Amino acid sequence: GVTLFVALYDYEARTEDDLSFHKGEKFQIVNNTEGDWWLAHSLTTGETGYIPSNYVAPV
């Protein structure tokens, strides 16, 4: 099945296509083949955007 990811720390986005999120927020990863910023879909907000991959861990 799928691997969800959980935020380890809060984060405030600083660029246009990045998500802001809270520790504990969960994500499905849409794309991880373009570097360390991953396109992710938040299970809290329903939004899609980039997250720093070191801010999450697999659930």
- Spans of all domains in the chain: 1-59
HSE value, Cβ hemisphere, 13 Å, CA-based, for 17: 6
- SS3 label, residue 54: helix
The rounded distance, in Å, linking the Cα atoms of 46 and 40 is 10
CA 43 to each of CA 28, 46, 47: distance values in angstroms, whole numbers, following the listed order: 7, 6, 8
